[PDB]
């Protein structure tokens, strides 16, 4: 049969009208159309060239490729909150959700400063956690994480959690932290040397996800936040994703790469891959259905401080 | 789950602008549409709510405290409040009590102010009475002193913070100045009076420069100088700028708060490193949203501290500013902490930035940068037209979980949720897009909420229904995809039991749903009465009733597919006729109300209770189904002035109304307002205000923090100290305790922390004035002699680099020969001899004072010399003095060598100020203490009553001594113990044979006090030391 | 010029002696101040009454010519102030604090610049040594 390429919005929104329109709510092309599509398209639309041309040859160590909006199914990195056989991806929706969020930082126990509030929440002062960083992430529940200064921050956030749940996460000590990815699975020579910039595969945060998330079978990034800008005691892990992410041309190729050589499509390597799926998303939802007495909304209050995850009392 | 009777205010008026205050006592008040709003800073949440006015309030100003506190005055709180019918209140605010009513014809009051002189009488206050008339009031009695008529517009006035005697008032024509002001006569005559060359926003004195003023305009801001009567001074904005709209000044640190048209705040502070004064921007804020519905009033700034600031906004809302120091003309960072050199910068102002200095003059030099920050928000009611419901009843069932939460509507598509036993926002959602019409409750925890679009010309109504879940807050719609055309719902009804609901239109028939399963029940066919009013019955079958147009009464009941509770059915009419129709005795009563239409009526909830309430078109009404009699009346009108626009019931014992203006009440059966105290209100976070307590425990909270090593360990608790009282008082002062900021109580926790700057936190925290400036200066001078703001207690050469300075300026805008004859006569008291002779020389030859001013010139340079033949030119001098002639002989006499005798001969004629100016700036410092010194007596005269200032002289002339013996006189025996133990600790003065009995002394009354308060362990510790005169406190109390 | 100095004394004291009114005490102030007795002058200077409107500029005069004895330091600013007043057109004034500060014939050029040779000749006579005055008395000769 065929493998196909889950997508979202944001690639389409991101002669091509002809066919633009077409994708704005048919969204079926074949690989037919693919032949004038690939044409038509010789940032976003640099890296899809080189994802298109990738998924034909090889990739058997025969299928005809089509997009749409079936034996494998492979999105790309980060899937936007507004929506979302084998699965290269997240297995449940929550696990692009602000619950995996917290999920990770639960595991691993360190992270940046988190505060989820629940909707209809009035906030009167400033947390004292949140006064010494300079920018702070604001992510909405379904909506897109933004940067904001932290000094007018009580007026916009009282007229956000009006309509939806809201997420705080500090940023930055001194201005615009620095976020640096790093593709997983993790091949054999990045796990000798010491820690560098160049070279963060060293890191106990990483040590630990290593040992319960299962990434040797799975393909994306994770990033990381230093808000002090090497020592290890200065990043902090702030998402995982799962897919090809399509944002810049250098973590293309090598995400695309490591797809080849271990080898994510064998159906031998496959198989192992149906029963690391059944068992994240158990423990997912044991975890999220735990602070809880499409996605389900937050009921009560959650602050993360010091690695450990409470109840916020006010 | 007890509950109090409150209220909640919303938006503001136009006529309370200019009503908010931030006393000494850290609460903020501002002036709602007819009441009284105090709340804090640090805590941001409503305290007490004010209830006497009969009108729009339009002026609220805090009490001064610049007095000593004892057992006879101790610490409290009081207010004053003016209204637009010219009536001024005088409030207690820890009991909500009025204290005096003061009331003077009917006009709008313009402006009303303290007194901060207040020696000798602590209640005396100054209003504006229009057109032309100033009344001072007394505060106790109610009593005027004197009344005063003028030929002007009075529009404000300001205090000179330096002299009392000089006022300043601010007219339609000018400026009319007064330097006669005293509480025993009324002013003399008009006064002196100075046009302008109409637009004046403001007019206030600056508490930072001696004889300084602004002038606020739209686009820009002008400082003028009083004996010249000359701008030295002007900050403009650029073209492209928002004009200003409030200026507020600064004391501690010479710097202004400034308030533009966007709601921007900016502080400039005076350039004091690399002619005329500028002032550069320093921090700014950001603006925010400008429509024609909303923008900001005015702001204000907190006096202790200075380092906050508050803005006020239309809508209701507080928003609250800090100001925070990081290590464009340098600033640099004070050498000493907290009065002498782990730190706190962001204590206050005075610890941020160092002290103000001369630009243009040659160890450790930090850079500081200044930022604010936002870090309260407050929120209110919104506009009005409400939708209020309330929870169902407690019940024996539910509870073990309930909670008196209240809903309100709005015409925006919001829900507001409050806890009524807290009085603080619960939840705030936003479902519907149109006006809420009614709110209706499925269970404890879920409620539903309609509304309903403008009618279009065929006069279809798109009609929204959603179901809400308040723990979530997920919202899910009711009917679904019911489209866009139908007709709109007026009203829904839930059963008691929460099981079938009922929608009914203006034609289509009557609906069933089910709550439980979300579905359409059973439809009425077409051939079906209109329905005008439907009701459940409280008693898996339910029963309700409905009434046609026409009259008839149906009862039809519901199994699967207008008042009523017990046996009593109550119906209204457009008439107001209230009938009482029972289902056992079948027997009708009619009982002419004689009102206007009623609009719905209600029972009160709880079995056994047969009370109602009745709401007609301008008043509610409560009545008695088992005897038909009459409980209590509320009439728009006649006993309340506001109207009603909802009713519903509280509690068994407590009902809810909401009126026209945006405010929503908790009364009684009798509706009568209650005076609701501080004592019994329930507080969620602590609040840090020793007012609160009772004056035998603030005093007592004081003498504990100011002795801290207690027993050698450090600690915060009264528990490890034996004070013999109630429980009740001991964890009021353990809760206050608890409720101090982290980095305050690390400071006390300070066992390097000495002694004199415990002194100084602990006057900062209670907020006084006099207390503080009585330790800034006593620790300086003390730390000085060991090893701006305040005009006579610099030092010698401090002071004489300024009025240098300050002279210079004078010199460059010279505009008439006027001006040029006092800047030469200032020049040449100076001893600026040198530049004085050519500006001399400069007189045109058509002047008639030509001859006197050539011969004078000629006689300074040749003067310089002192020999032999000076003795008739004193002789002459001193002729002058004689004659009449004072500052022009004055002149002669400092010009040769003689100063001191100068400064005698102003003292003999009344001129202290100017002798005080002349000594510090010339003669020794050997001579100069003798003439202040004489000043000093001067002003303990029983006549002049300014001991204060006296202290203060007595301290910068170094003689402790005799600073130690009037505060034993005056009965300051709290001061007194702490400077002699100061004293001894900095080696001022040792105990030998003569002092020993005055320090003996101190330390018995000192142990007295503390015993009359009730503190026993401070008693014993200063007896002790006492000596000889502590032994029989020793053992009289052991 | 010695005969002629006893001669000016005897009638400047004549004239003291019966002095009537403020118009004539100033004149005999200016006689006085002119004609060296400057010891004497002081106390006749210390006598206007205390409502007089030129009580200030007397009382100056008293102290400047009491402290003016000297003629050292600070000799320039007076030389100033004198040819300007001289300039601005009040020439007895300034003739006479010429004549008070240290010198005459600077006064006598001054004098017969303005066409005032007989004042100027009386001056020459009663003042100035007879080595200067014989250069002013050839200059008034020729002028003659």
């Known amino acids: 049969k065929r493998i196909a390429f889950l997508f979202d919005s944001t690639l389409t929104a991101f002669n091509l009208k002809s066919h633009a329109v077409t994708m704005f709510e048919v969204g079926k092309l074949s690989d037919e159309s693919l032949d004038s599509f690939l044409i038509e398209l010789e940032d976003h639309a640099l890296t899809l060239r080189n994802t298109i041309l990738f998924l034909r040859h090889n990739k058997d160590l025969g299928f005809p490729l089509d997009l749409l909006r079936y034996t494998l199914l492979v999105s790309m990195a980060p899937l936007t909150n507004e929506i979302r056989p084998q699965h290269i991806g997240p297995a449940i929706p929550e696990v692009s959700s602000v619950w995996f969020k917290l999920y990770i930082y639960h595991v691993t126990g360190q992270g940046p400063p988190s505060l989820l509030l629940s909707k209809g929440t009035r906030l009167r002062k400033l947390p004292d956690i949140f006064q010494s960083y300079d920018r702070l992430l604001i992510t909405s529940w379904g909506h897109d994480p933004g940067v904001v200064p932290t000094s007018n921050v009580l007026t916009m956030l009282n007229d956000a959690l009006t309509h939806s749940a809201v997420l705080i996460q500090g940023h930055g000590l001194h201005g615009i932290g620095e976020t640096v990815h790093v593709p997983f699975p993790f091949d054999e020579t990045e796990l000798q040397g010491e820690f560098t910039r160049v070279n963060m595969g060293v890191h106990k945060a990483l040590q630990i996800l290593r040992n319960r998330v299962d990434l040797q079978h799975l393909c994306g990034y994770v990033t990381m936040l230093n808000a002090s800008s090497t020592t290890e005691a200065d990043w902090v892990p702030l998402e995982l994703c799962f897919g090809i992410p399509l944002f810049s041309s250098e973590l293309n190729r090598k995400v695309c790469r490591k797809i080849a050589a271990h080898g994510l499509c064998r159906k031998e390597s496959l198989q192992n891959l149906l029963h690391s799926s059944r068992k994240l998303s158990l423990q997912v939802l044991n975890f999220v259905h735990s602070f809880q007495e499409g996605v389900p909304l937050p009921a009560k209050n959650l602050i993360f401080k010091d690695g450990v995850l409470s109840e916020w009392s006010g | 789950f007890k509950v109090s009777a409150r209220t909640l205010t919303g938006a503001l008026n136009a006529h309370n602008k200019a009503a908010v205050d931030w006393g000494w006592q850290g609460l903020i008040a501002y002036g709602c549409h007819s009441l009284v709003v105090v709340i804090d800073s640090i805590t941001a949440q409503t305290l007490q709510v004010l209830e006497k006015h009969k009108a729009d309030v339009v002026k609220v100003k805090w009490a001064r405290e610049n007095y000593h506190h004892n057992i006879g005055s101790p610490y409290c709180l009081r207010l004053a409040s003016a209204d637009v019918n010219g009536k001024i209140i005088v409030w207690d605010v820890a009991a909500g009590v009025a204290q005096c009513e003061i009331q003077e014809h009917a006009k709008p009051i313009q402006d009303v102010q303290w007194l901060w002189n207040q020696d000798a009488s602590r209640d005396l206050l100054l209003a504006i009475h229009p057109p032309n008339y100033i009344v001072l009031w007394n505060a106790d009695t109610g009593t005027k002193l004197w009344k005063k008529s003028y030929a002007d517009n009075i529009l404000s006035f300001s205090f000179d913070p330096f002299d009392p005697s000089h006022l300043t008032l601010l007219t339609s024509e000018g400026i009319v100045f007064i330097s006669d002001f005293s509480p025993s006569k009324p002013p003399s005559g008009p006064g002196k009076k100075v046009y302008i060359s109409n637009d004046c926003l403001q007019l206030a004195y600056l508490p930072s420069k001696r004889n300084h003023m602004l002038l606020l305009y739209p686009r820009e801001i002008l400082i003028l100088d009083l004996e010249v009567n000359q701008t030295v001074g002007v900050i403009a904005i650029e073209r492209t700028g928002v004009p200003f709209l409030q200026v507020i000044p600064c004391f501690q640190r010479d710097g202004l708060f400034c308030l533009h048209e966007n709601g921007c705040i900016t502080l400039r502070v005076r350039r004091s490193y690399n002619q005329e004064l500028t002032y550069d921007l320093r921090s700014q804020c950001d603006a925010i949203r400008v429509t024609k519905t909303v923008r900001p009033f005015s702001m204000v700034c907190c006096p202790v501290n200075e380092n906050a600031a508050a803005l006020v906004v239309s809508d209701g809302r507080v928003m609250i500013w800090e100001l925070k120091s990081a290590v464009v003309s340098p600033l640099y960072s004070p050498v000493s902490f907290c009065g002498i050199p782990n730190k706190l ?135 679904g995809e019911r489209g866009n055309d139908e007709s709109a719902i007026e009203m829904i009804k839930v059963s008691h039991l929460k099981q079938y609901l009922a929608v009914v239109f203006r034609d289509k028939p009557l609906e069933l749903w089910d709550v439980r399963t979300c579905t359409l029940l059973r439809e009425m066919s077409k051939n079906f009465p209109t329905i005008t009013a439907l009701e459940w019955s409280p008693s898996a079958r339910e029963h309700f009733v409905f009434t046609d147009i026409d009259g008839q009464v149906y009862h039809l009941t519901v199994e699967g597919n207008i ?476």
């Open chain 2, 345 to 479: 910068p962001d204590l206050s102002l005075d610890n941020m930035i160092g002290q103000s200095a001369i630009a243009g003059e040659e160890s450790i030099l930090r850079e500081v940068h200044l930022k604010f920050l936002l870090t309260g928000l407050l929120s209110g009611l919104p506009a009005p037209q409400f939708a209020i419901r309330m929870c169902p009843p407690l019940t024996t069932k539910n509870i073990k979980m309930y909670q008196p939460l209240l809903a309100v509507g709005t015409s925006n598509g919001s829900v507001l949720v409050y806890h009524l036993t807290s009085g603080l926002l619960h939840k705030e959602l936003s479902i519907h897009s149109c006006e809420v019409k009614g709110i209706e409750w499925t269970s404890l925890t879920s409620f539903l909420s309609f509304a309903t679009s403008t009618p279009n010309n065929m006069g279809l109504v798109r009609n929204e229904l959603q179901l809400v879940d308040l723990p979530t807050g997920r919202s899910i719609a009711f009917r």
């Open chain 2, 563 to 1038: 008042a009523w509770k017990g046996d009593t059915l109550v119906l209204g009419d457009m008439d107001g006729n209230l009938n009482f129709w029972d289902l056992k005795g079948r027997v009708s009563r009619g009982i002419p109300t004689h009102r206007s239409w009623v609009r719905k009526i209600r029972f009160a909830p709880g079995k056994g209770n047969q009370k109602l309430i009745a709401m007609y078109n301008d008043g509610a009404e409560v009545w008695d189904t088992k005897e038909v009699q009459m409980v209590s009346s509320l009439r728009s009108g006649r006993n309340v002035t506001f109207r009603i626009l909802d009713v519903d019931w509280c509690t068994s014992d407590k009902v809810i109304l909401a009126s026209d203006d945006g405010c929503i009440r908790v009364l009684e059966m009798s509706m009568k307002s209650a005076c609701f105290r501080m004592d019994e209100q329930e507080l969620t976070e602590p609040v840090w205000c020793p007012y609160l307590l009772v004056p035998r425990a603030s005093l007592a909270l004081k003498a504990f923090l100011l002795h801290q090593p207690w027993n050698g360990q450090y600690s915060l608790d009264i528990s490890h100290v034996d004070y013999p009282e109630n429980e009740e008082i001991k964890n009021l002062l353990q809760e206050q305790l608890n409720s101090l900021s982290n980095d305050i109580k690390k400071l006390l926790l300070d066992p390097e922390f000495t002694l004199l700057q415990r002194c100084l936190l602990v006057s900062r925290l209670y907020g006084d004035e006099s207390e503080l400036h009585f330790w800034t200066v006593a620790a300086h001078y003390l730390h000085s002699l060991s090893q701006i703001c305040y005009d006579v207690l610099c030092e010698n050469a401090y002071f004489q680099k300024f009025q240098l300075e300050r002279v210079n300026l004078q010199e460059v805008k010279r505009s008439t020969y006027d001006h040029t004859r006092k800047c030469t006569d200032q020049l040449l008291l100076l001893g600026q001899t040198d530049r004085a002779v050519q500006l001399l020389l400069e007189t045109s030859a058509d002047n008639q004072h030509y001859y006197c001013d050539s011969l004078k010139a000629c006689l300074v340079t040749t003067v310089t010399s002192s020999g032999p033949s000076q003795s008739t030119i004193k002789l002459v001098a001193t002729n002058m003095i004689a004659n009449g002639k004072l500052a022009e002989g004055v002149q002669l006499l400092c010009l040769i060598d003689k100063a001191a005798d100068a400064c005698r001969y102003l003292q003999t004629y009344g001129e202290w100020n100017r002798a005080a100016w002349l000594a510090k700036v010339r003669l020794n410092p050997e001579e100069c203490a003798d003439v202040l010194r004489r000043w000093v007596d001067h002003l303990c005269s029983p006549q002049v009553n300014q001991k204060s200032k006296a202290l203060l002289v007595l301290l910068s002339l170094g003689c402790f001594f005799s600073v130690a013996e009037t505060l034993h006189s005056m009965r300051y025996f709290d001061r007194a113990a702490l400077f002699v133990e100061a004293c001894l600790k900095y080696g001022a003065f040792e105990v030998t044979e003569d002092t020993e009995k005055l320090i003996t002394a101190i330390y018995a009354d000192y142990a007295r006090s503390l015993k009359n308060l009730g503190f026993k362990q401070g008693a014993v510790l200063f007896a002790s030391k006492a000596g000889a005169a502590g032994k029989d406190l020793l053992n009289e109390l052991e």
